[model samples]
Target chain A: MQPFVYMAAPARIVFSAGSSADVAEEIRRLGLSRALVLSTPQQKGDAEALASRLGRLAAGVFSEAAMHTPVEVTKTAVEAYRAAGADCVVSLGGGSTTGLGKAIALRTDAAQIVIPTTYAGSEVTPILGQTENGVKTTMRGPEILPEVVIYDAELTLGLPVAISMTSGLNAMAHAAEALYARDRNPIASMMAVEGLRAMIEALPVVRQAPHDIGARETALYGAWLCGTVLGAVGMSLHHKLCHTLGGSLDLPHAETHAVLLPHTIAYVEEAAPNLLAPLAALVGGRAGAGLFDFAARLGAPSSLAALGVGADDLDPMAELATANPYWCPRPIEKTAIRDLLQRAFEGARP
Target chain B: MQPFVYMAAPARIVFSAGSSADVAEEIRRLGLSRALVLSTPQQKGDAEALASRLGRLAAGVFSEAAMHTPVEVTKTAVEAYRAAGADCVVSLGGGSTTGLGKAIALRTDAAQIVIPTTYAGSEVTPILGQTENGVKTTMRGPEILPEVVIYDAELTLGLPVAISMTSGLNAMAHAAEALYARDRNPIASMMAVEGLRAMIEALPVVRQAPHDIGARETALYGAWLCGTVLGAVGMSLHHKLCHTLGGSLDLPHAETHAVLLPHTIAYVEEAAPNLLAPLAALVGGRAGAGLFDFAARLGAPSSLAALGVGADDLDPMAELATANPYWCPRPIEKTAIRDLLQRAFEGARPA
Candidate 1:
């Protein structure tokens, strides 16, 4: 075979029905003591429960993790961690909580244990994105990667139907971009396809019957696969656009992803036709259109305007997106991106 | 969306047609000096060339890396590394050289600059498998992974058609297992399929004409994907079996992998049918039968007997393979493993 190289992520995964019960054990395994538990204000009850479970192992609970992980919010959490005499942090929510946990870890080099409660795949990647001065910048480091990840399907059973749809679609966006990522590897590709497939199958059942435990399990399984793939490979245009829209406009994280996916996929479709078939299968239609439809079917808002972004912000958002470019399947063009932004703002079908 | 977590690999990759030329620059970027060049005896010429290329930066060349990394060989290389005052090692060949480089780095915590000329894919992983006392043992640490990898396809043009086939197949084995690995992820699965598809297409062209540069380049690209998959996830029965056969019985590395791939795939086929379709496409037939045909078409050895292993040794090999059991698609059963080995020994086409 021709010469080549491969690199692996260094993180231990604990997957099972009650994997979260081992959180204290995992913390001790990492030789960490006085671990702080983090969650959003809405998840304070769960955080308290987790803290109670940890008992003395728990340092304290910081239930103020906000969406988008604002620098100010992170500062507050960091101070809380220091004041609590915490050596590590356990994040027990969706992207916002995990992002906050990573932000704290990035600064203190504290070990992290992330338990995801939505389809946001950010928990798997080493990238920690924080919004400061109304702009989100991501820094990647081994320290930011969680020391232990616990996947439990039961944790997501109570997620709102609209949130579930948007989150699953958000996770699907990770695998979609992975199909054509610059650092794409065979292992990532395999996971991407299967992850998308499983999500596609599970999402509809979830919409039809929100309490379907088996479907919830399948969706969680897909999320794990997709999240792992996103972590292994580099992100593309889709992720860049979401970061821009979400950070700059303060858009809802999962909703922004659900709306922007179709437009971004459409933007790069010609450049990466090989991704079309698998993506089409995963989303149950033309990939871009199908995502738009899926979100609408789940009663999710599909427009930036719906998420509180002013139409006037569109020009600056597009400009900012084009300015600090990452890799994309298609060459990034201001005109094309501007048009894509317009479509997302209008919430046009695929 | 169910709650799930992901972990990303943080190693920086430098990939291009002539990226090897940037190795010294990368080393300088890492603030490393006294770089030792490593290679197997077969690639000593390449090692010397690299040393000369490094000029004043060159520490020396150590070309004694052996297959499976015998403990004695690692010691010799370690001594060479220290004697040369090398602060870094530039691995200049395939798995053996990279493995040796890792062995030395594990001891010294020296930075690694790897230029792989085959599809072994071990360079990017923290794992190191070394043989000591007739048993192969594996260990992992962040220090064992190379800080930088330079993928230059031009280096692989010298690989003979036979070696290319075996090596590519071995790399394919990585993707095959990765598809259903314990920590399997969507990103890894996508890469695995694409890598398998690319290699399957390129291998035939390379076999038809060994000097087909385009085909060679494609195969190299595929190998990168496959190797990345291998490094990203855990291994299963296929890798464990090959390691046991090669480390214990002294079978040729790639040949043993080529011979055992079909039987192992057969053993797992019923357990992982989701893998069969894409895998079949790679080998161009049923997952099990097609692998046998693919090996034969590439002129790779298809039987354990073709290698130096004796029939009487099968029992011992099976025992060793079963001992300290690793992960596999099917439950580890001695009887099943013995039957699999017998089929491989007799060179029978996979049922």
Candidate 2:
């Protein structure tokens, strides 16, 4: 009953096993007729299939949606969008296309419709990160919030087992920190606990049987909720550490999360015990070490060295991570962080 | 994992003790200046106190907000609203006053800020029921949804114990039926369970000490959650039954809900076992029987007979309720409904 502000997202969530079939109707509800489809080069087939589904509503396809939503690529997409006279953009695939849709939305009154194929969760969020000249900066405004999000679990049945494990854990990291976020609400906390439970349980089953629609549904549903938590509240040390390791060292995004989540969780394990009970239920022993063990059990990479981070890069990454002023339940210091890095670097059980 | 559409409300809820003191600030955030404070005749003094609190922001106080939101009163309030040059209407009473504020908002381009003082959750909903020339009809559109709702737990400290129980149950009925609602989603269902848990646990303590701030806080918070559920999803047979009795028989609103909820629940008991399990845990055995016993413990009315409904009125009421087609987990049948009304009329415990 503690006092907190509750802001429900205006994004209309249409989720089902094959909800992508409803995209044209959803776009019609938003009063937009023409929709340009977006995807990465590897996922152009998905974009074209969606265009065929959209039929008369489809403007065309922009298959060059690049990683980190580079500004140059957005320029090209915008050119295609204007030439096609599109009123809205339907983005498929993972974060790249969702980010592309958001970037397109900022410069005009065009609406965005996002269909996430991976657990990246950039679809429902208002925040956007774009790269220009190899530098990534972020800008978030209400305008970037997607007008509609369609989560079709069938679309994710083909995600690789390795990607499922890392991305599922990456999604869980948001909900884990959201439980003790400084500006948390009862609603978001409810979603956070349920999100963790679903993602934690679904990842193992999904890893073993990728084509199981029930498991895929559970994983995608959990990702939807965890992504909701990420959009609703702020993340702390786990996210900041992942940003340092992944961005500065050029590691894979979800893989970095899979490696560092256990250590980051252990660092703040004692600061918020009440918020850690749900995590504790899933983790038999300690929340941090238990997650590390859980990740290892799921066949995910648990060591920074395994993920391609050299020992020489640890000190500079630690300094850069702590240098920026941030909020963490436990205070950030150099010695403890360096030691923590060495443990993570070696793949030792936290 | 089931297919469901989650339509989150755009309403921003600001809740705390003594949040009414920050009304002018909330108004400013809505980009409004002058305000018309609404209330019933008995609550005019309270309205005046709030107007005085608003000081320069106060346009005037309209104390004629009547029951069921009669159209004539709204016309007067609208005239006052126009004459005072008010930009927004601040509703500071129960459902009637909140509805008045909504009626005003529907006509003018102004906004509404509702400060509820009862367990009636009319503030957060987009639905509006207006009475014109003795006929009451409900219409809901997005435009009438209150722009902001400020829940102040301090306001309900003075409500009578009996009124609180019945009104709190009235709110619970929304959440209870929402569990099996055809349009229900996971998030609203989550709120439903938690809301029922909160209101059920808080009622006994509230009955003992009406001034206990913590109990009052819990009840108010439960009311907020239950009200949100009512606004979000569709209500079922329970709501329709209460609507028929209250509107046709002129039974009191909250008291009618208190009497008929057990019967409505028992009618639909077998249709949704999985949905009813959470309520079964709260209720001890059966959702219907448990609610009947729970309402009796709260000292709420459990029979239509005590609320001025005659035994002779049962058959016609059943016919009226079942004649119109509506959505219910249990199919509406004349004989079963007639028998159900007979049981409710006699205050008999269900199977």
Candidate 3:
């Protein structure tokens, strides 16, 4: 009953295995036609399949969606969008395509229906990060959020085990950080706890049997909740650190989150012990060491150095992280950040 | 991971103890200048106090808000609203005043800020029931929902213990029914469980210490969650039965809910045991018997007969309830409905 403000954004979610089959019906439900499907080159085939499923409702496929949501690529997509004369965009893959849909909606005010394939959880978020001239900038508004999100676990059955583990952890990081978010509300925090529990329980099952529809559904459900938390609340050090690594070092986003989460939790362990209790309970020990062990057992990447960050880059990265620091339970200091980065670099268990 | 569709409506809620202090700030936050404060005739002083507190922001106070939102009263309130040139309304009372605010907003499309003092829970719902020429009709839409709901537990400290018990049970009905709602989603269902847990734990403590701020806060929180669930999902037999009794027999709303809830739940008990498991778990036995015992302990009225419904009224009440029955786990049968009404009239335990 602690005093808090909860601002709920409008959301329409249809979640189940093979929910992507209903995309055209969902489009019709939205009173929309002529949906341009979006995906990266790697997912172009899946996007084309979806377009084919959409039949006459399909405008065309814009398959140039790239990582970091390059503005140059978006310009070409916009041209394709106008050429197709689409009323809406169906982002049919991971974070990249979701970002492209958001970028398009930001400009054209067209509705977006996101069908997330990976556990990257960007489909439910209002914030979009785009790269312009190799500099990543993030923005938030109602327009940037997708109008509908279709979570189909059947679409995720083919994700490689390594990507699944890291992406699940990446999704879990949003919920983990949400537990200690500055503007956390009871409802979102509840989602966070449930999200963490689901992902924690389902990830191992997913690893054992990647094509298990039940595990995939549970994991996808967790991702939806975690992504919802990320959209509803602000994240602290882990996300800020990941953003820095991704933007500055050009490191992989999910892998960066997998490596830095435990270290960041360790840094803030004392400051927000009560808030971090859920994490500790879920992991069966201290939040940091437990997550580090959890990640290790999952065979996720354990070191920033594995992602190609060198000892020389640590100081500059630390400076960059501290220069425009996010609000954290424990205050961000340059020396401490540098030390934390060093531990993460060497993959030291918290 | 059950397949479910969740459609979330836009909501802005500010909940705390002494949150009424932020009313003016909230009004301004909504970018509204002139304000009309609404309350029941009984709560006119509180409405005036709120107006005095608002000072320049106050447009006026119209304190004739009544039960079931009588259309005639709404017309006068709308006149008052327009004469005051208010941009928004601040409803400050229980369900009655909240309904008036909603009725006014339905006509004007003006924004509404509801500050509820009782657990009537109408503040959070998009549904409005209006009484015209002694027949009550309900409607629902975005315009009927309040733009903002500010829950201040401090305001409930002075509510009479009898009213508090019944009103709280009335709120609990929303959550209990939400558990087995036809369109229930996980989040709303989760809130229903938590809401039931909160109200059940807090109500007895509230009965013991009428002024305890912490218990009051928790109960208010429960009411908020329950009301949110009611807004989010469709209710089943219990709510529909209460609506029938309240509309036809002119029974007191909360008291009727407090009375009929257990019986209605008992009727659906066998059909939705899985859905009703959480209620049983929370109450430590069968959902119907446990709720009955709980209400009896809380000194809540446990029979339609106690609310002045005679044996003669039971037959027609059953017919009325079954005529346009809500979707229930167990299909509604006229004979079964009459039998259920007979048990409720006699205050028989589920067994």
Lowest summed lDDT over 10 consecutive residues: which window, candidate 1 chain A?
Answer: A1-10
TM-score (all chains, Cα) for each model: 0.49, 0.50, 0.51
lDDT of 3 at A20: 85
Encode model 3's per-residue lDDT on B47-164: one tens digit a residue.
8889999999999988767667877668878988999999999999899889999999999998999999889888889999886644688999998989999999988876656668
Model 2 residue runs over 4 Å out of place are A1-350
Give, for candidate 3 chain B, the lowest lDDT window spanning 10 residues.
B303-312
Model 1 lDDT tens row, B96-204: 8899999998888888989888877887778898765435689987778788888887777656455678888899899888877877788888899998898888888
Write down the RMSD of candidate 1 (Cα, Å). Answer: 29.8
lDDT of each: 0.79, 0.84, 0.85
Model 2 chain A weakest lDDT span, ten residues long: A302-311
**Runs with alpha carbons beyond 4 Å of true place in candidate 3:** A1-350
Candidates ranked by lDDT: 3, 2, 1
Q: Candidate 2 — which pairs collide?
A: none
Model 1 TM-score relative to the real fold? 0.49
Model 2, A18-113: lDDT tens per residue? 899899999999998999998765465667888998889999988766567767668878999999999999988889889999999997657998
